[PDB]
Structure 1
């Protein structure tokens, strides 16, 4: 992530165009200004932006374009173009010359444009964004076509498939000796932090401070770095200046790092050798009007709501969040379970198609590879953050058909070898209980999604309590692992009230979140709770979604339901980081 000692190109509006006939790449639309274009805002999903029904569901090729002035002060320095996130696929051109491409979507991609750019004159930038999903994209999907060439995309996750440019686009400048790769690992017993470095024609000189420039250690090398002697309450974080020296130019890069070591012991999650208890939300990158587009106002407000309601942790649910969320996350010291876009590997979640989930035509080969790629990138971007205490390879995969274990074992192995300093998990779906799941052993923490009283035993608390209890303590006796409930919630209309406290009413969300909390309290292995969704969010059209997913404690415009004050009483009434002693 860039700092300096740049011109943020995401300012203002871009030219936006559709490619229904799919003429763009053939007719070389990037070598000219978009014919019949309209203004679009970055960052922001293109679907909700124009109130156009046909634009919202369009599946194909979209074209962004924007001219920019390259500042004169960057004469002999390398000019680099960074896209913090272009959702699903993007191919970037700089003034008649093709520079870059990436099929990531929720992770950045950058390219060196020093030759193709002459600092001082205006150059045009054309981005081709694709929002298609097949079986080798993360998350997976499948497109269908018919007569008239109308393309219709179908996917297997819940949230709506927003696309476009979702995070800032940067255009940064570094001297010809840059610090391309950095790694830092911290230890603590009852300690210090090894440092790393990768550069070109430059030596490494590492120093680190605390409050302000008050160095309290130092080191000269690409290893070791140990010296003098970060909490979930405040979050004390030192500033690690890295220096790369050359004959002519010098480079200085500041990296905030917090001393912490996370490890699992029996059925306890230890951050700095202390048992913890997770409370908070599994949220989404969703908002009114802008899709998954990032915005600072929303981050400030949502963090205010989480601070008020007593949440101490949350999970970047179902895709990598914007890194600003993680910088804030280690600033205010909130625990984060980071997760990849690996979601939807299941054909059993049917609103009420290949024949076997781990066949060749679906999830085999490039699917496993590209999943390992999403791992490699998520870790290569979020490795240094002290707020990240957990890895999460995938979310709710069907592990019942033949070949699921053969799929998930190598990913666990490679991911563990990539970052051994943090525990790893895989959130499993509800249809795979303790007697049918075959993957929960590969991972350090078991994550659970449970909806007893909603999908099954619908509306019956008296029996859903028993089934949840039996399933829970049966998990505990089965694997003797720390179990975090990462999804538990029920849909609720914001204004619907009912004397009988039946489903969809706020009284049922309150009484349903309560029983789950008692069963949570009488189980020793439950190392945390995360009510399903923070706020109501947009999903695809189905007969089970009443204008999106209504399982939020807050509405979409961030207004509280009756459960927000219940949870604010529960989480702030207990001691921070502690679980109730069975009551």
Structure 2
């Protein structure tokens, strides 16, 4: 399973994940026995490599002929792909998909091999020792596609809420694999309503994007938390062959807009009742199956949340599909957490950030659940060099998506110099956990400073992180910190304060569940875990579960 829906009926495709591959470590001075191992999966979950860091090899066979495409939804975190023993592609960043295109391969059985690598080092500026694990392995799915002469790379649909109703445009990208000129047509339908026909002329080996006008969609019903209506959009490449290729995605008609201090969904003023959620599970690493995803979402919905924040990297497209279908709002951000100014000066940092953003928005553009793009969680936005990166990455996002609001979760308390750029100002604060200041006092001081002393003034404002730690099981009448009883007190006051802060659009609690972290963080991280889950790593509700549930269920999605 790759999506909750079929993205192709014309194109010949086959999933090569949901299978056992042969797995062995490489580059050790140990026995490198070959085992059978699941794809998707992480090798920290296989008994023999439970604390392995480095390189390992995944291999299987496939049968194909002609032009083919190999799509990897995620490889943790550095990949080398080899077909029949020849290097054919490479990738960095565990959380975005990439592909390999191979022209006119001999028929029959072929050998596929993926070297996955989760080493830390100078070549890796995003995956570093951090307050979340960098797993290893083929953590999301793999798809083999047999292509014709030319194929559809992506389709991007934008709805528009005009005075007279719903409009929309579509942009399609076509890649000519043939050395000759290509003439054809792309016909677009949305939900079996006729939309557009884009005539196609492509030179040899050219990839080109084509756009429709802004067209009426009087038949469209809107997407919202209360009514998450989705339509299948289908684009068909027609050439002298015939219906040669297709691409199918899903869209929701919804408008996300900022106006003053208001985040507006379909004209209504939005209240965020959110959770920060990592892709982490003690059996599945970051390769969580559909059943584990939906189990998280039912707990999150049971807590009364309307939104998730993808800390701190793009998410599996299966998960975003599930959020589309259930009306869950998504803050999605590029892969970065707490990188210093010196980390951002790594020779690869800008290129790696650029590649993450490009793949994230190119692949995830159509998800109506995504309402905001985040960047550079808690990076050095108080420095001049830090500002330079923020500026570039913000404007990279505008060039890819000129319509969704942008933001970045900050912790430079009253020293941020990058608040002028984004549409939404966002802050991570931990009064009552890391600081013994009353939550109301701390939040008021920060908020006045943003309104009076920063270029963030007048913009909508979110607390993108607040919460407290607690070790499940540890309970004492002393209510000391790390006890479940103290987490209850902390969250009750924290949620009371954010929901009472005039000008604040809501909150993401840090965080949904407990998370495995890197070993170097053990000094401040009991159990080598981040312990601020409202549910523990096995999804057992802590005492604070009821406190969060009482808060979130007592408020609606709108102001």
TM-score (norm 2): 0.88
Distance 1:136 1:92, change over 3 A: closer
Residue 168 of structure 1 and its aligned partner are, at CA, apart by: 1.1
Counterpart-to-counterpart distance in 2, 1:14 and 1:539: 27
Distance 1:287 1:172, change over 3 A: same
Q: Structure 2 residue aligned with 1:433, among 397, 407, 413?
A: 413
Unaligned runs of 5+ in 2: 177-181, 199-210
Are 1:186 and 2:156 matched, yes or no? no
Distance 1:480 1:134, change over 3 A: farther
Determine helix, strand or coil for the equivalent of 1:47. helix
Distance 1:329 1:138, change over 3 A: farther
Counterpart-to-counterpart distance in 2, 1:35 and 1:398: 41
* 2:40 corresponds to: 43
Are 1:246 and 2:239 matched, yes or no? yes
* 1:151 corresponds to: none
Residue 193 of structure 1 and its aligned partner are, at CA, apart by: 0.7
* 1:29 corresponds to: none
* 2:423 corresponds to: 444
Q: Structure 2 residue aligned with 1:311, among 292, 296, 305?
A: 305
Distance 1:563 1:376, change over 3 A: same
Residue 10 of structure 1 and its aligned partner are, at CA, apart by: 1.2
* 1:568 corresponds to: 549
Number of aligned residue pairs: give it: 520
Distance 1:464 1:309, change over 3 A: closer
Residue 320 of structure 1 and its aligned partner are, at CA, apart by: 0.8
* 2:279 corresponds to: 285
Counterpart-to-counterpart distance in 2, 1:397 and 1:231: 32
* 1:321 corresponds to: 315
Residue 113 of structure 1 and its aligned partner are, at CA, apart by: 3.2
Distance 1:244 1:362, change over 3 A: closer
Counterpart-to-counterpart distance in 2, 1:559 and 1:35: 37
Counterpart-to-counterpart distance in 2, 1:84 and 1:570: 37
Counterpart-to-counterpart distance in 2, 1:306 and 1:244: 40
Counterpart-to-counterpart distance in 1, 2:255 and 2:389: 29
User: Residue 49 of structure 1 contacts residue 289 of structure 1 at CA under 8 Å; is this kept in 2?
Assistant: no
Counterpart-to-counterpart distance in 2, 1:362 and 1:297: 37
Are 1:113 and 2:102 matched, yes or no? yes
Unaligned runs of 5+ in 1: 24-33, 142-154, 347-356
* 2:534 corresponds to: 553
User: Residue 362 of structure 2 contacts residue 400 of structure 2 at CA under 8 Å; is this kept in 1?
Assistant: no
Within 5 A, what are the aligned runs for 1:198-213? 198-199=173-174, 200=176, 201=182, 202-209=184-191, 213=192
* 1:27 corresponds to: none
* 2:205 corresponds to: none
Are 1:232 and 2:225 matched, yes or no? yes
Q: Structure 1 residue aligned with 2:517, among 524, 539, 543?
A: 539
Determine helix, strand or coil for the equivalent of 2:416. coil
Distance 1:96 1:116, change over 3 A: farther
* Structure having the larger proportion of residues in strand: 2
Are 1:67 and 2:68 matched, yes or no? no
Determine helix, strand or coil for the equivalent of 2:111. strand
CA deviations over 1:23-70 (Å, ceiling 9, x no partner): 9xxxxxxxxxx97312222111112321x4xx3443332111112344
Distance 1:445 1:135, change over 3 A: farther
Counterpart-to-counterpart distance in 2, 1:340 and 1:543: 27
Residue 391 of structure 1 and its aligned partner are, at CA, apart by: 0.7
User: Residue 314 of structure 1 contacts residue 336 of structure 1 at CA under 8 Å; is this kept in 2?
Assistant: yes
* 1:3 corresponds to: 8
User: Residue 238 of structure 1 contacts residue 256 of structure 1 at CA under 8 Å; is this kept in 2?
Assistant: yes
Determine helix, strand or coil for the equivalent of 1:533. coil
Counterpart-to-counterpart distance in 1, 2:76 and 2:127: 14
* 2:111 corresponds to: 124
User: Residue 237 of structure 1 contacts residue 257 of structure 1 at CA under 8 Å; is this kept in 2?
Assistant: yes
Range with greater deviation from structure 2 (245-254 or 263-272): 245-254
Counterpart-to-counterpart distance in 2, 1:245 and 1:535: 48
